[PDB]
PDB file of all heavy atoms in Angstrom:
ATOM      1  N   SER A   1      71.790-134.030  -3.519  1.00  0.00           N
ATOM      2  CA  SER A   1      72.342-133.581  -2.248  1.00  0.00           C
ATOM      3  C   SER A   1      71.398-132.676  -1.470  1.00  0.00           C
ATOM      4  O   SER A   1      71.744-132.250  -0.364  1.00  0.00           O
ATOM      5  CB  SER A   1      73.671-132.854  -2.482  1.00  0.00           C
ATOM      6  OG  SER A   1      73.576-131.959  -3.577  1.00  0.00           O
ATOM      7  N   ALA A   2      70.218-132.371  -2.016  1.00  0.00           N
ATOM      8  CA  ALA A   2      69.295-131.467  -1.338  1.00  0.00           C
ATOM      9  C   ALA A   2      68.581-132.148  -0.176  1.00  0.00           C
ATOM     10  O   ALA A   2      68.289-131.505   0.838  1.00  0.00           O
ATOM     11  CB  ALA A   2      68.278-130.914  -2.335  1.00  0.00           C
ATOM     12  N   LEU A   3      68.297-133.444  -0.300  1.00  0.00           N
ATOM     13  CA  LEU A   3      67.509-134.175   0.684  1.00  0.00           C
ATOM     14  C   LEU A   3      68.352-134.759   1.813  1.00  0.00           C
ATOM     15  O   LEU A   3      67.930-135.738   2.439  1.00  0.00           O
ATOM     16  CB  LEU A   3      66.716-135.291  -0.002  1.00  0.00           C
ATOM     17  CG  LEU A   3      65.386-134.950  -0.683  1.00  0.00           C
ATOM     18  CD1 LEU A   3      64.380-134.434   0.329  1.00  0.00           C
ATOM     19  CD2 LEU A   3      65.557-133.958  -1.826  1.00  0.00           C
ATOM     20  N   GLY A   4      69.530-134.193   2.081  1.00  0.00           N
ATOM     21  CA  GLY A   4      70.372-134.728   3.137  1.00  0.00           C
ATOM     22  C   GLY A   4      69.750-134.590   4.513  1.00  0.00           C
ATOM     23  O   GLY A   4      69.928-135.455   5.377  1.00  0.00           O
ATOM     24  N   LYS A   5      69.013-133.500   4.736  1.00  0.00           N
ATOM     25  CA  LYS A   5      68.387-133.280   6.036  1.00  0.00           C
ATOM     26  C   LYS A   5      67.335-134.343   6.326  1.00  0.00           C
ATOM     27  O   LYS A   5      67.043-134.636   7.491  1.00  0.00           O
ATOM     28  CB  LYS A   5      67.773-131.882   6.091  1.00  0.00           C
ATOM     29  CG  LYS A   5      67.304-131.465   7.471  1.00  0.00           C
ATOM     30  CD  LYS A   5      66.614-130.116   7.428  1.00  0.00           C
ATOM     31  CE  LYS A   5      67.603-128.993   7.176  1.00  0.00           C
ATOM     32  NZ  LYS A   5      66.939-127.660   7.215  1.00  0.00           N
ATOM     33  N   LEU A   6      66.743-134.918   5.280  1.00  0.00           N
ATOM     34  CA  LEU A   6      65.819-136.029   5.448  1.00  0.00           C
ATOM     35  C   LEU A   6      66.514-137.383   5.432  1.00  0.00           C
ATOM     36  O   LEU A   6      66.013-138.325   6.053  1.00  0.00           O
ATOM     37  CB  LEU A   6      64.749-135.997   4.354  1.00  0.00           C
ATOM     38  CG  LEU A   6      63.544-135.103   4.625  1.00  0.00           C
ATOM     39  CD1 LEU A   6      62.588-135.120   3.450  1.00  0.00           C
ATOM     40  CD2 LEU A   6      62.848-135.554   5.884  1.00  0.00           C
ATOM     41  N   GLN A   7      67.644-137.502   4.739  1.00  0.00           N
ATOM     42  CA  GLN A   7      68.350-138.774   4.639  1.00  0.00           C
ATOM     43  C   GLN A   7      69.102-139.118   5.922  1.00  0.00           C
ATOM     44  O   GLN A   7      69.164-140.290   6.313  1.00  0.00           O
ATOM     45  CB  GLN A   7      69.315-138.741   3.452  1.00  0.00           C
ATOM     46  CG  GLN A   7      70.154-139.994   3.297  1.00  0.00           C
ATOM     47  CD  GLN A   7      69.347-141.173   2.795  1.00  0.00           C
ATOM     48  OE1 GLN A   7      68.404-141.010   2.023  1.00  0.00           O
ATOM     49  NE2 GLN A   7      69.713-142.371   3.234  1.00  0.00           N
ATOM     50  N   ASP A   8      69.680-138.115   6.587  1.00  0.00           N
ATOM     51  CA  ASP A   8      70.441-138.397   7.801  1.00  0.00           C
ATOM     52  C   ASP A   8      69.543-138.903   8.923  1.00  0.00           C
ATOM     53  O   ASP A   8      70.002-139.649   9.795  1.00  0.00           O
ATOM     54  CB  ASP A   8      71.220-137.157   8.243  1.00  0.00           C
ATOM     55  CG  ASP A   8      70.321-135.994   8.609  1.00  0.00           C
ATOM     56  OD1 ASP A   8      69.087-136.123   8.496  1.00  0.00           O
ATOM     57  OD2 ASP A   8      70.856-134.941   9.012  1.00  0.00           O
ATOM     58  N   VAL A   9      68.264-138.521   8.913  1.00  0.00           N
ATOM     59  CA  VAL A   9      67.325-139.037   9.905  1.00  0.00           C
ATOM     60  C   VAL A   9      67.187-140.548   9.769  1.00  0.00           C
ATOM     61  O   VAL A   9      67.206-141.282  10.764  1.00  0.00           O
ATOM     62  CB  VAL A   9      65.965-138.327   9.772  1.00  0.00           C
ATOM     63  CG1 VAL A   9      64.862-139.154  10.406  1.00  0.00           C
ATOM     64  CG2 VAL A   9      66.028-136.947  10.400  1.00  0.00           C
ATOM     65  N   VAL A  10      67.051-141.036   8.535  1.00  0.00           N
ATOM     66  CA  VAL A  10      66.997-142.476   8.305  1.00  0.00           C
ATOM     67  C   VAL A  10      68.333-143.122   8.648  1.00  0.00           C
ATOM     68  O   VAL A  10      68.383-144.218   9.224  1.00  0.00           O
ATOM     69  CB  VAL A  10      66.590-142.763   6.848  1.00  0.00           C
ATOM     70  CG1 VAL A  10      66.608-144.255   6.576  1.00  0.00           C
ATOM     71  CG2 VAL A  10      65.223-142.176   6.556  1.00  0.00           C
ATOM     72  N   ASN A  11      69.432-142.456   8.290  1.00  0.00           N
ATOM     73  CA  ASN A  11      70.757-143.026   8.507  1.00  0.00           C
ATOM     74  C   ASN A  11      71.034-143.243   9.990  1.00  0.00           C
ATOM     75  O   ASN A  11      71.601-144.268  10.381  1.00  0.00           O
ATOM     76  CB  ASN A  11      71.822-142.121   7.889  1.00  0.00           C
ATOM     77  CG  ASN A  11      71.997-142.359   6.407  1.00  0.00           C
ATOM     78  OD1 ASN A  11      71.505-143.346   5.863  1.00  0.00           O
ATOM     79  ND2 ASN A  11      72.699-141.451   5.742  1.00  0.00           N
ATOM     80  N   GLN A  12      70.642-142.284  10.831  1.00  0.00           N
ATOM     81  CA  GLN A  12      70.907-142.400  12.262  1.00  0.00           C
ATOM     82  C   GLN A  12      70.168-143.586  12.870  1.00  0.00           C
ATOM     83  O   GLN A  12      70.740-144.351  13.654  1.00  0.00           O
ATOM     84  CB  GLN A  12      70.524-141.104  12.973  1.00  0.00           C
ATOM     85  CG  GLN A  12      71.467-139.950  12.696  1.00  0.00           C
ATOM     86  CD  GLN A  12      71.058-138.682  13.413  1.00  0.00           C
ATOM     87  OE1 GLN A  12      69.871-138.395  13.561  1.00  0.00           O
ATOM     88  NE2 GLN A  12      72.043-137.917  13.867  1.00  0.00           N
ATOM     89  N   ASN A  13      68.892-143.754  12.520  1.00  0.00           N
ATOM     90  CA  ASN A  13      68.126-144.881  13.043  1.00  0.00           C
ATOM     91  C   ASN A  13      68.691-146.205  12.543  1.00  0.00           C
ATOM     92  O   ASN A  13      68.811-147.174  13.308  1.00  0.00           O
ATOM     93  CB  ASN A  13      66.656-144.741  12.653  1.00  0.00           C
ATOM     94  CG  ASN A  13      66.077-143.397  13.039  1.00  0.00           C
ATOM     95  OD1 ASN A  13      66.540-142.757  13.982  1.00  0.00           O
ATOM     96  ND2 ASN A  13      65.060-142.960  12.307  1.00  0.00           N
ATOM     97  N   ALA A  14      69.044-146.268  11.255  1.00  0.00           N
ATOM     98  CA  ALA A  14      69.612-147.494  10.711  1.00  0.00           C
ATOM     99  C   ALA A  14      70.942-147.842  11.357  1.00  0.00           C
ATOM    100  O   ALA A  14      71.247-149.027  11.523  1.00  0.00           O
ATOM    101  CB  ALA A  14      69.783-147.370   9.198  1.00  0.00           C
ATOM    102  N   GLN A  15      71.740-146.841  11.724  1.00  0.00           N
ATOM    103  CA  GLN A  15      73.012-147.108  12.384  1.00  0.00           C
ATOM    104  C   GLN A  15      72.797-147.538  13.830  1.00  0.00           C
ATOM    105  O   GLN A  15      73.489-148.428  14.338  1.00  0.00           O
ATOM    106  CB  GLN A  15      73.906-145.872  12.309  1.00  0.00           C
ATOM    107  CG  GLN A  15      75.285-146.064  12.902  1.00  0.00           C
ATOM    108  CD  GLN A  15      76.306-145.134  12.284  1.00  0.00           C
ATOM    109  OE1 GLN A  15      75.985-144.338  11.403  1.00  0.00           O
ATOM    110  NE2 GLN A  15      77.549-145.235  12.737  1.00  0.00           N
ATOM    111  N   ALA A  16      71.838-146.909  14.513  1.00  0.00           N
ATOM    112  CA  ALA A  16      71.560-147.264  15.900  1.00  0.00           C
ATOM    113  C   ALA A  16      71.064-148.700  16.013  1.00  0.00           C
ATOM    114  O   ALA A  16      71.492-149.449  16.900  1.00  0.00           O
ATOM    115  CB  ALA A  16      70.541-146.294  16.496  1.00  0.00           C
ATOM    116  N   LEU A  17      70.159-149.105  15.120  1.00  0.00           N
ATOM    117  CA  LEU A  17      69.661-150.476  15.162  1.00  0.00           C
ATOM    118  C   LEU A  17      70.769-151.478  14.861  1.00  0.00           C
ATOM    119  O   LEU A  17      70.849-152.540  15.491  1.00  0.00           O
ATOM    120  CB  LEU A  17      68.503-150.646  14.183  1.00  0.00           C
ATOM    121  CG  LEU A  17      67.112-150.512  14.801  1.00  0.00           C
ATOM    122  CD1 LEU A  17      66.039-150.652  13.739  1.00  0.00           C
ATOM    123  CD2 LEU A  17      66.920-151.538  15.901  1.00  0.00           C
ATOM    124  N   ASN A  18      71.633-151.158  13.897  1.00  0.00           N
ATOM    125  CA  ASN A  18      72.743-152.046  13.568  1.00  0.00           C
ATOM    126  C   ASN A  18      73.699-152.190  14.745  1.00  0.00           C
ATOM    127  O   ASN A  18      74.182-153.291  15.037  1.00  0.00           O
ATOM    128  CB  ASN A  18      73.478-151.527  12.334  1.00  0.00           C
ATOM    129  CG  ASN A  18      74.760-152.278  12.063  1.00  0.00           C
ATOM    130  OD1 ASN A  18      74.792-153.508  12.103  1.00  0.00           O
ATOM    131  ND2 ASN A  18      75.829-151.542  11.786  1.00  0.00           N
ATOM    132  N   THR A  19      73.988-151.084  15.433  1.00  0.00           N
ATOM    133  CA  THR A  19      74.834-151.150  16.617  1.00  0.00           C
ATOM    134  C   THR A  19      74.183-151.953  17.735  1.00  0.00           C
ATOM    135  O   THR A  19      74.878-152.697  18.433  1.00  0.00           O
ATOM    136  CB  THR A  19      75.170-149.737  17.098  1.00  0.00           C
ATOM    137  OG1 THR A  19      76.135-149.151  16.218  1.00  0.00           O
ATOM    138  CG2 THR A  19      75.743-149.763  18.505  1.00  0.00           C
ATOM    139  N   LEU A  20      72.865-151.837  17.904  1.00  0.00           N
ATOM    140  CA  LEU A  20      72.174-152.654  18.896  1.00  0.00           C
ATOM    141  C   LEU A  20      72.277-154.135  18.556  1.00  0.00           C
ATOM    142  O   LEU A  20      72.460-154.975  19.444  1.00  0.00           O
ATOM    143  CB  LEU A  20      70.709-152.230  18.998  1.00  0.00           C
ATOM    144  CG  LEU A  20      69.889-152.932  20.079  1.00  0.00           C
ATOM    145  CD1 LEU A  20      70.515-152.721  21.440  1.00  0.00           C
ATOM    146  CD2 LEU A  20      68.454-152.448  20.067  1.00  0.00           C
ATOM    147  N   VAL A  21      72.148-154.475  17.272  1.00  0.00           N
ATOM    148  CA  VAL A  21      72.230-155.877  16.863  1.00  0.00           C
ATOM    149  C   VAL A  21      73.641-156.418  17.068  1.00  0.00           C
ATOM    150  O   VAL A  21      73.825-157.556  17.516  1.00  0.00           O
ATOM    151  CB  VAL A  21      71.773-156.040  15.403  1.00  0.00           C
ATOM    152  CG1 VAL A  21      72.015-157.458  14.928  1.00  0.00           C
ATOM    153  CG2 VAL A  21      70.310-155.689  15.271  1.00  0.00           C
ATOM    154  N   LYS A  22      74.656-155.614  16.747  1.00  0.00           N
ATOM    155  CA  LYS A  22      76.035-156.088  16.836  1.00  0.00           C
ATOM    156  C   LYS A  22      76.452-156.390  18.270  1.00  0.00           C
ATOM    157  O   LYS A  22      77.480-157.039  18.489  1.00  0.00           O
ATOM    158  CB  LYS A  22      76.984-155.062  16.220  1.00  0.00           C
ATOM    159  CG  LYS A  22      76.959-155.026  14.705  1.00  0.00           C
ATOM    160  CD  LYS A  22      77.575-156.285  14.123  1.00  0.00           C
ATOM    161  CE  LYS A  22      79.072-156.331  14.375  1.00  0.00           C
ATOM    162  NZ  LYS A  22      79.700-157.542  13.777  1.00  0.00           N
ATOM    163  N   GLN A  23      75.685-155.927  19.257  1.00  0.00           N
ATOM    164  CA  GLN A  23      76.053-156.137  20.652  1.00  0.00           C
ATOM    165  C   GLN A  23      75.746-157.544  21.148  1.00  0.00           C
ATOM    166  O   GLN A  23      76.114-157.870  22.281  1.00  0.00           O
ATOM    167  CB  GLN A  23      75.347-155.116  21.542  1.00  0.00           C
ATOM    168  CG  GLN A  23      75.904-153.713  21.427  1.00  0.00           C
ATOM    169  CD  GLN A  23      77.329-153.614  21.924  1.00  0.00           C
ATOM    170  OE1 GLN A  23      78.273-153.601  21.136  1.00  0.00           O
ATOM    171  NE2 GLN A  23      77.495-153.539  23.238  1.00  0.00           N
ATOM    172  N   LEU A  24      75.080-158.377  20.349  1.00  0.00           N
ATOM    173  CA  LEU A  24      74.810-159.745  20.775  1.00  0.00           C
ATOM    174  C   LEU A  24      75.993-160.674  20.549  1.00  0.00           C
ATOM    175  O   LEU A  24      75.933-161.836  20.965  1.00  0.00           O
ATOM    176  CB  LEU A  24      73.585-160.307  20.051  1.00  0.00           C
ATOM    177  CG  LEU A  24      72.205-159.885  20.554  1.00  0.00           C
ATOM    178  CD1 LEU A  24      71.914-158.456  20.162  1.00  0.00           C
ATOM    179  CD2 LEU A  24      71.130-160.815  20.028  1.00  0.00           C
ATOM    180  N   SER A  25      77.055-160.201  19.905  1.00  0.00           N
ATOM    181  CA  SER A  25      78.245-160.997  19.637  1.00  0.00           C
ATOM    182  C   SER A  25      79.388-160.611  20.569  1.00  0.00           C
ATOM    183  O   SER A  25      80.557-160.617  20.182  1.00  0.00           O
ATOM    184  CB  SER A  25      78.673-160.848  18.180  1.00  0.00           C
ATOM    185  OG  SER A  25      77.618-161.199  17.303  1.00  0.00           O
ATOM    186  N   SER A  26      79.059-160.269  21.811  1.00  0.00           N
ATOM    187  CA  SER A  26      80.043-159.837  22.792  1.00  0.00           C
ATOM    188  C   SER A  26      79.981-160.745  24.009  1.00  0.00           C
ATOM    189  O   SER A  26      78.895-161.099  24.476  1.00  0.00           O
ATOM    190  CB  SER A  26      79.808-158.385  23.208  1.00  0.00           C
ATOM    191  OG  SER A  26      80.301-157.495  22.227  1.00  0.00           O
ATOM    192  N   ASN A  27      81.155-161.122  24.517  1.00  0.00           N
ATOM    193  CA  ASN A  27      81.210-162.037  25.651  1.00  0.00           C
ATOM    194  C   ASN A  27      80.845-161.337  26.954  1.00  0.00           C
ATOM    195  O   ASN A  27      80.205-161.936  27.826  1.00  0.00           O
ATOM    196  CB  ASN A  27      82.600-162.660  25.753  1.00  0.00           C
ATOM    197  CG  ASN A  27      82.947-163.505  24.547  1.00  0.00           C
ATOM    198  OD1 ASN A  27      82.409-163.305  23.459  1.00  0.00           O
ATOM    199  ND2 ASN A  27      83.854-164.456  24.733  1.00  0.00           N
ATOM    200  N   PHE A  28      81.252-160.077  27.108  1.00  0.00           N
ATOM    201  CA  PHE A  28      81.080-159.312  28.341  1.00  0.00           C
ATOM    202  C   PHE A  28      81.746-159.982  29.538  1.00  0.00           C
ATOM    203  O   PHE A  28      81.350-159.749  30.683  1.00  0.00           O
ATOM    204  CB  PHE A  28      79.601-159.050  28.649  1.00  0.00           C
ATOM    205  CG  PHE A  28      78.916-158.174  27.644  1.00  0.00           C
ATOM    206  CD1 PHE A  28      78.065-158.715  26.698  1.00  0.00           C
ATOM    207  CD2 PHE A  28      79.109-156.806  27.656  1.00  0.00           C
ATOM    208  CE1 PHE A  28      77.431-157.909  25.778  1.00  0.00           C
ATOM    209  CE2 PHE A  28      78.479-155.996  26.738  1.00  0.00           C
ATOM    210  CZ  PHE A  28      77.639-156.548  25.798  1.00  0.00           C
ATOM    211  N   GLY A  29      82.759-160.810  29.296  1.00  0.00           N
ATOM    212  CA  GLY A  29      83.475-161.510  30.341  1.00  0.00           C
ATOM    213  C   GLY A  29      83.118-162.973  30.475  1.00  0.00           C
ATOM    214  O   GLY A  29      83.858-163.718  31.132  1.00  0.00           O
ATOM    215  N   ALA A  30      82.016-163.412  29.873  1.00  0.00           N
ATOM    216  CA  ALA A  30      81.628-164.811  29.947  1.00  0.00           C
ATOM    217  C   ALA A  30      82.517-165.652  29.033  1.00  0.00           C
ATOM    218  O   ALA A  30      83.398-165.146  28.332  1.00  0.00           O
ATOM    219  CB  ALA A  30      80.155-164.971  29.581  1.00  0.00           C
ATOM    220  N   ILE A  31      82.282-166.967  29.042  1.00  0.00           N
ATOM    221  CA  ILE A  31      83.087-167.885  28.241  1.00  0.00           C
ATOM    222  C   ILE A  31      82.617-167.982  26.797  1.00  0.00           C
ATOM    223  O   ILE A  31      83.363-168.495  25.949  1.00  0.00           O
ATOM    224  CB  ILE A  31      83.099-169.299  28.850  1.00  0.00           C
ATOM    225  CG1 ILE A  31      81.712-169.933  28.746  1.00  0.00           C
ATOM    226  CG2 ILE A  31      83.554-169.250  30.297  1.00  0.00           C
ATOM    227  CD1 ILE A  31      81.696-171.405  29.057  1.00  0.00           C
ATOM    228  N   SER A  32      81.410-167.515  26.490  1.00  0.00           N
ATOM    229  CA  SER A  32      80.899-167.571  25.129  1.00  0.00           C
ATOM    230  C   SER A  32      79.835-166.497  24.963  1.00  0.00           C
ATOM    231  O   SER A  32      79.184-166.097  25.931  1.00  0.00           O
ATOM    232  CB  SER A  32      80.326-168.954  24.802  1.00  0.00           C
ATOM    233  OG  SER A  32      79.555-168.918  23.615  1.00  0.00           O
ATOM    234  N   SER A  33      79.665-166.040  23.726  1.00  0.00           N
ATOM    235  CA  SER A  33      78.714-164.982  23.415  1.00  0.00           C
ATOM    236  C   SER A  33      77.344-165.509  23.013  1.00  0.00           C
ATOM    237  O   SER A  33      76.433-164.708  22.785  1.00  0.00           O
ATOM    238  CB  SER A  33      79.265-164.090  22.299  1.00  0.00           C
ATOM    239  OG  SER A  33      79.258-164.767  21.055  1.00  0.00           O
ATOM    240  N   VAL A  34      77.172-166.824  22.925  1.00  0.00           N
ATOM    241  CA  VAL A  34      75.899-167.436  22.567  1.00  0.00           C
ATOM    242  C   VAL A  34      75.367-168.174  23.787  1.00  0.00           C
ATOM    243  O   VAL A  34      76.116-168.884  24.469  1.00  0.00           O
ATOM    244  CB  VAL A  34      76.033-168.365  21.345  1.00  0.00           C
ATOM    245  CG1 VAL A  34      76.976-169.514  21.629  1.00  0.00           C
ATOM    246  CG2 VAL A  34      74.671-168.883  20.920  1.00  0.00           C
ATOM    247  N   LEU A  35      74.081-167.977  24.081  1.00  0.00           N
ATOM    248  CA  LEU A  35      73.511-168.463  25.330  1.00  0.00           C
ATOM    249  C   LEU A  35      73.242-169.961  25.322  1.00  0.00           C
ATOM    250  O   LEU A  35      73.099-170.551  26.397  1.00  0.00           O
ATOM    251  CB  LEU A  35      72.219-167.702  25.632  1.00  0.00           C
ATOM    252  CG  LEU A  35      71.626-167.843  27.033  1.00  0.00           C
ATOM    253  CD1 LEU A  35      72.581-167.275  28.063  1.00  0.00           C
ATOM    254  CD2 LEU A  35      70.279-167.155  27.116  1.00  0.00           C
ATOM    255  N   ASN A  36      73.179-170.593  24.151  1.00  0.00           N
ATOM    256  CA  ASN A  36      72.909-172.024  24.088  1.00  0.00           C
ATOM    257  C   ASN A  36      74.122-172.872  24.441  1.00  0.00           C
ATOM    258  O   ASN A  36      73.968-173.925  25.069  1.00  0.00           O
ATOM    259  CB  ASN A  36      72.404-172.405  22.696  1.00  0.00           C
ATOM    260  CG  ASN A  36      70.947-172.048  22.488  1.00  0.00           C
ATOM    261  OD1 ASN A  36      70.109-172.289  23.356  1.00  0.00           O
ATOM    262  ND2 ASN A  36      70.637-171.469  21.335  1.00  0.00           N
ATOM    263  N   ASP A  37      75.324-172.440  24.052  1.00  0.00           N
ATOM    264  CA  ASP A  37      76.524-173.199  24.387  1.00  0.00           C
ATOM    265  C   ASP A  37      76.759-173.231  25.891  1.00  0.00           C
ATOM    266  O   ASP A  37      77.154-174.264  26.442  1.00  0.00           O
ATOM    267  CB  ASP A  37      77.737-172.614  23.667  1.00  0.00           C
ATOM    268  CG  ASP A  37      77.675-172.817  22.168  1.00  0.00           C
ATOM    269  OD1 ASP A  37      76.698-173.435  21.693  1.00  0.00           O
ATOM    270  OD2 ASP A  37      78.600-172.359  21.465  1.00  0.00           O
ATOM    271  N   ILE A  38      76.526-172.108  26.572  1.00  0.00           N
ATOM    272  CA  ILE A  38      76.708-172.067  28.019  1.00  0.00           C
ATOM    273  C   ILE A  38      75.764-173.047  28.701  1.00  0.00           C
ATOM    274  O   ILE A  38      76.154-173.765  29.630  1.00  0.00           O
ATOM    275  CB  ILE A  38      76.511-170.633  28.543  1.00  0.00           C
ATOM    276  CG1 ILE A  38      77.516-169.685  27.889  1.00  0.00           C
ATOM    277  CG2 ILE A  38      76.653-170.593  30.052  1.00  0.00           C
ATOM    278  CD1 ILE A  38      77.305-168.236  28.249  1.00  0.00           C
ATOM    279  N   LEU A  39      74.509-173.096  28.252  1.00  0.00           N
ATOM    280  CA  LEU A  39      73.542-174.007  28.850  1.00  0.00           C
ATOM    281  C   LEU A  39      73.814-175.463  28.495  1.00  0.00           C
ATOM    282  O   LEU A  39      73.524-176.347  29.307  1.00  0.00           O
ATOM    283  CB  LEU A  39      72.128-173.624  28.418  1.00  0.00           C
ATOM    284  CG  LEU A  39      71.558-172.365  29.071  1.00  0.00           C
ATOM    285  CD1 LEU A  39      70.287-171.932  28.366  1.00  0.00           C
ATOM    286  CD2 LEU A  39      71.303-172.597  30.550  1.00  0.00           C
ATOM    287  N   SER A  40      74.356-175.732  27.312  1.00  0.00           N
ATOM    288  CA  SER A  40      74.645-177.095  26.890  1.00  0.00           C
ATOM    289  C   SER A  40      76.041-177.558  27.281  1.00  0.00           C
ATOM    290  O   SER A  40      76.414-178.690  26.962  1.00  0.00           O
ATOM    291  CB  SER A  40      74.473-177.223  25.374  1.00  0.00           C
ATOM    292  OG  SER A  40      74.987-178.457  24.909  1.00  0.00           O
ATOM    293  N   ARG A  41      76.819-176.714  27.956  1.00  0.00           N
ATOM    294  CA  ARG A  41      78.185-177.054  28.328  1.00  0.00           C
ATOM    295  C   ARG A  41      78.448-177.043  29.826  1.00  0.00           C
ATOM    296  O   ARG A  41      79.353-177.758  30.272  1.00  0.00           O
ATOM    297  CB  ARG A  41      79.171-176.089  27.651  1.00  0.00           C
ATOM    298  CG  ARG A  41      80.619-176.529  27.690  1.00  0.00           C
ATOM    299  CD  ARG A  41      81.517-175.515  27.006  1.00  0.00           C
ATOM    300  NE  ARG A  41      81.104-175.252  25.633  1.00  0.00           N
ATOM    301  CZ  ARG A  41      81.657-174.335  24.851  1.00  0.00           C
ATOM    302  NH1 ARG A  41      82.644-173.566  25.278  1.00  0.00           N
ATOM    303  NH2 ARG A  41      81.206-174.186  23.608  1.00  0.00           N
ATOM    304  N   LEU A  42      77.692-176.287  30.616  1.00  0.00           N
ATOM    305  CA  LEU A  42      77.977-176.099  32.030  1.00  0.00           C
ATOM    306  C   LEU A  42      76.879-176.713  32.887  1.00  0.00           C
ATOM    307  O   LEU A  42      75.727-176.832  32.462  1.00  0.00           O
ATOM    308  CB  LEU A  42      78.116-174.612  32.378  1.00  0.00           C
ATOM    309  CG  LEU A  42      79.502-173.975  32.277  1.00  0.00           C
ATOM    310  CD1 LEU A  42      80.468-174.638  33.241  1.00  0.00           C
ATOM    311  CD2 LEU A  42      80.026-174.046  30.860  1.00  0.00           C
ATOM    312  N   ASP A  43      77.254-177.103  34.102  1.00  0.00           N
ATOM    313  CA  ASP A  43      76.284-177.610  35.056  1.00  0.00           C
ATOM    314  C   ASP A  43      75.389-176.475  35.548  1.00  0.00           C
ATOM    315  O   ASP A  43      75.806-175.314  35.580  1.00  0.00           O
ATOM    316  CB  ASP A  43      76.989-178.269  36.238  1.00  0.00           C
ATOM    317  N   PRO A  44      74.152-176.784  35.928  1.00  0.00           N
ATOM    318  CA  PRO A  44      73.205-175.736  36.344  1.00  0.00           C
ATOM    319  C   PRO A  44      73.705-174.906  37.517  1.00  0.00           C
ATOM    320  O   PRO A  44      73.393-173.708  37.581  1.00  0.00           O
ATOM    321  CB  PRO A  44      71.942-176.530  36.714  1.00  0.00           C
ATOM    322  CG  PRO A  44      72.025-177.756  35.882  1.00  0.00           C
ATOM    323  CD  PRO A  44      73.488-178.088  35.751  1.00  0.00           C
ATOM    324  N   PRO A  45      74.439-175.479  38.488  1.00  0.00           N
ATOM    325  CA  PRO A  45      74.943-174.622  39.579  1.00  0.00           C
ATOM    326  C   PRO A  45      75.777-173.434  39.124  1.00  0.00           C
ATOM    327  O   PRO A  45      75.636-172.344  39.692  1.00  0.00           O
ATOM    328  CB  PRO A  45      75.782-175.582  40.435  1.00  0.00           C
ATOM    329  CG  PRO A  45      75.378-176.941  40.058  1.00  0.00           C
ATOM    330  CD  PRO A  45      74.472-176.902  38.877  1.00  0.00           C
TER     331      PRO A  45
END
């Protein structure tokens, strides 16, 4: 438990990167969260 001041530094970065990655599975109002389905399903207009 002594190295917590050094461990939390790693923990914060690891959590921030994980949260950044998890944001790719969000629709944000669109019909799908993956960019290939939209391009393979909708007309270019």
Side-chain angles (χ1 to χ4, degrees), residues 1-42 44-45:
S1 44
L3 278 297
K5 190 184 289 183
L6 275 178
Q7 177 73 33
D8 63 358
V9 159
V10 177
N11 277 347
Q12 288 180 324
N13 307 333
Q15 183 154 0
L17 264 178
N18 171 46
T19 286
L20 184 58
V21 173
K22 285 290 291 182
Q23 287 295 101
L24 281 74
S25 304
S26 281
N27 297 24
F28 295 103
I31 68 168
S32 166
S33 71
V34 62
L35 193 63
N36 282 315
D37 292 359
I38 301 174
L39 286 168
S40 169
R41 194 180 304 175
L42 270 298

